[PDB]
Amino acid sequence: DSALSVVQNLEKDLQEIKAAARDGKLKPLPGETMEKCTQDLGNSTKAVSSAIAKLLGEIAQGNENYAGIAARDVAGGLRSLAQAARGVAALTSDPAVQAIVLDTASDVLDKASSLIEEAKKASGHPGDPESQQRLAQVAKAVTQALNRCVSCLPGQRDVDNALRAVGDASKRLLSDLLPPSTGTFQEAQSRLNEAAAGLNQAATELVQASRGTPQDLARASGRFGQDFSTFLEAGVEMAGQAPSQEDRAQVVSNLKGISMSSSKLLLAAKALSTDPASPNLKSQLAAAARAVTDSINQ
Amino acid sequence: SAKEVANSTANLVKTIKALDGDFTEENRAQCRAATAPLLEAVDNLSAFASNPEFSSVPAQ
Amino acid sequence: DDFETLPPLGQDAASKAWRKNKMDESKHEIHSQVDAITAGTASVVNLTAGDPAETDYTAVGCAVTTISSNLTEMSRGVKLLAALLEDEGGNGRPLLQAAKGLAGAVSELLRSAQPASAEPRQNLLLAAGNVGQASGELLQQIGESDTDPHFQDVLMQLANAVASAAAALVLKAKSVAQRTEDSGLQTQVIAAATQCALSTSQLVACTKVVAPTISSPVCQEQLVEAGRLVAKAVEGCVSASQAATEDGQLLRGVGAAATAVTQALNELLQHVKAHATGAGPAGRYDQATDTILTVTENIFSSMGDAGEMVRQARILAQATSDLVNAIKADAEGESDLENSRKLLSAAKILADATAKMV
C-alpha cells in the first residue's frame, strides 16, 4: 500500500518535473552528471526489471510478506529511475527529450501502479492462473515502456532502430524469398566473404570506439548495419542461385545465425553505450564479436 | 526460479516423450506450449542475471 | 572566517528538498562531533588529574587529534549550514562567532596541555569550563541541543551539593587530623584532602563540559570515570579517617563520605536517565505498557516452557486489570461518554485476550 502511495509521490514529482519543463529549465543537482545519469538510468532499468521478476516469483509462491518487500523494492527502483530521469531532464536541451522522459517515466510508473494493485489482489486471493498471466503481460508492458525510456537518447535510438531494421529486413527476407538475378556462384560468394570480413572488421572498430566516444560508436554501428544489409541480400541471392534446395536452406540458416549474432552484438553495443566504464560487459561485447565472427566463419 | 525451470523442464521431458515419431502437429503445439512457459522462466533468469547491484565487483 | 562558495541551488522543489536534507545532516553530525570534542576534553581532564611520571600522554594526544579533526569538520559542515541560512535569512555570524570561541577555547586548553605550561591545574579547569560553555552557546546557536534544561540543571545543583559536602568533609578531616597524635599520618590525611579537593574540582569542570553534550554516550562514560575518580578520592578520605584513633567525629567524616557516595550515585542515575529519556513527558500508563511489552517479548521469546508462560501471563493479566480499572477511572473522569465507552470496549477486549491467555 505504501508502494502505491509512493507511485503517487513519484507522479507528484513527475508533475513538478512537468512544471520545470514548462519553465523550460531544470537545474541539475551539484552531484548529478549526464554520464552518471546514463549509468543511473541503465542500472535502475535493470534493477526495477529484476525487482518485477521478484514480484512474479513471489506471486508465483503467492501470499507472502516478501511480496510486499519486493513491492517496496520496485518502488525504490522507480524512485531511482526518477532520480535518473530528473537528471537527464535537468541536463538535456531538446524540449522533446524532456517531454519523452516525462512521458516514458509516467507510463512506466502508472503501469507500475496497475502492478501494485494487481499484486495486492494477488496477495488477497490465492489460486487463479489468470491473475498470473495478467501480471505477466503487464510486466511485459512496463518492460517495453522501460525500453522506450532507455532509448530516449537519440543517438542510441537510430542505431538500435537500425538493428531492428536489419533484423526485419532479414525476416522479410526469410519468408522463402527468392531473388531473380541468380548470377554466378563464384563472384557472389567471394564478395560475400569480403562483406563478412568488412562486417567483423566493423565490429573491431565498434570495440575500438568502445574505447572511444559514443557518437562514433553509433555511426560505425550504422555502417555495420547497412553493410550487413548488403551482406544478407548477398546471401539471399546465393539462395536464389543455389543448385540445391537443402544447400539453399543451409545458406539461409547460416545467414539467420549471423543475423542473431549481429543482433546480440549491437544489443551489447547499446548496453555499453550505457556506460563508458563497465569493463565486464565490454569483454562480453568482445565475446559477442567472437560469436559473430563464428557465424561468419561457418 | 530454478524450480519453475525444473518443472517446465519436466514439461519438456514429456514434450520429447510425445513428439517422438508422431509427426502430429498436436504434439508440436504441445511442445511449443511447454517451451513458452520455460521461455518466460528464462526471461526471469535473464532479469535476475541483470541484477545490477548483484552483478559484478570490478577490480581497480 | 571565509564563507563557503554558494553553487546554484535552483528554484526546483526537489532542489531545496535535498538542500534542507543536507542541512539536517550537517547539523546532526556537527552535534555528534562537538559532543566528541567535549568527550576528548573530559578525557583530558581525567588524565591530567594524574601526577606526572606516570602520565600516558598518548590518550591526551588522541583526544586533541579528534578535536582537530572535528574543528575542521565543524568548519566544513557549519559553513555549509551558514551558506544555506544565508540562502533563506542570512544570520550565520552568531554561529561563526560560536565556533570561533569553540576553537579559541580548544587552543587555550592546548595552552593548558603543555607541561611547559607550569600553570596550576585549576586554570586548566577554568578553560575547560569555558569549553563546555562555548559548546553550549554553539548547541543552542544551532538549537539542536537542549531537549530540556531541567535534568541538566538538576545535575548541576546536585554536583554542586557534592562539592559543598566534600568541602565540609574536608573540614571534618582537618579537624580529626588535628586530633591525631601521630606526625606524618595526618600528613597522609592532608594529601587525601588535597587530592579530594582536586577530585571535586575536576568533577565540577567535567559537569560544565558534559552538560551541553549529554546526548553522547561517550560523555556519559567520561562522567562515570569522573565519578570513579572522585570515588577513589572517597576511599582516600576513608583511609584518612582510618588514620584517626577511636573517635565519633571520624564516624562523622564517614557519614559525610557515605553521603558523598550516595550523591555521586544520584547524579549518575539522574544523568543516566536524562540521556536514557523519552522525547516526550510521562505519557499515560507508559510503565504499564512497557511492562506489558516486557512480558510480550518474554513470551515470544518463550515457546515450549509453560513453566514461564504461566508466570508471565499471570503478571500480564495483573497489570492488564490494573490498566483496565484505571481506564475505568479515567472514563469516569471522561465527560463525552463516547470516549468512556470506547475505553470500556477496549478494556473488555483486553479482558477477552487475558481470558484466552488463561
From Swiss-Prot, chain B:
Superkingdom: Eukaryota
Modified residues (N6-acetyllysine): K17
Compartment(s) of residence: Cell projection, Ruffle membrane; Cytoplasm, Cytoskeleton; Cell surface; Cell junction, Focal adhesion
Record function comment: High molecular weight cytoskeletal protein concentrated at regions of cell-matrix and cell-cell contacts. Involved in connections of major cytoskeletal structures to the plasma membrane. With KANK1 co-organize the assembly of cortical microtubule stabilizing complexes (CMSCs) positioned to control microtubule-actin crosstalk at focal adhesions (FAs) rims.
Free-text note on domains in this protein's UniProt record: Consists of an N-terminal FERM domain linked via a short unstructured region to a large flexible C-terminal rod which contains 13 amphipathic helical bundles (R1-R13). The rod begins with a five-helix bundle (R1) followed by three four-helix bundles (R2-R4). These are followed by a series of eight five-helix bundles (R5-R7 and R9-R13) in which the N- and C-termini are positioned at opposite ends of the bundle, creating a linear chain. The four-helix bundle R8 does not disrupt the chain because it is inserted into a loop in the R7 five-helix bundle.
Subunit-structure text: Part of a complex composed of THSD1, PTK2/FAK1, TLN1 and VCL. Interacts with THSD1; this promotes interaction with PTK2/FAK1 and VCL. Interacts with NRAP and LAYN. Interacts with SYNM. Interacts with ITGB1; the interaction is prevented by competitive binding of ITGB1BP1. Binds with high affinity to VCL and with low affinity to integrins. Interacts with APBB1IP; this inhibits VCL binding. Interacts with PTK2/FAK1. Interacts with PIP5K1C. Interacts with F-actin. Interacts with SVEP1.
Name of the protein in its database record: Talin-1
Portion of the full sequence shown: 1528 to 1587 of 2541
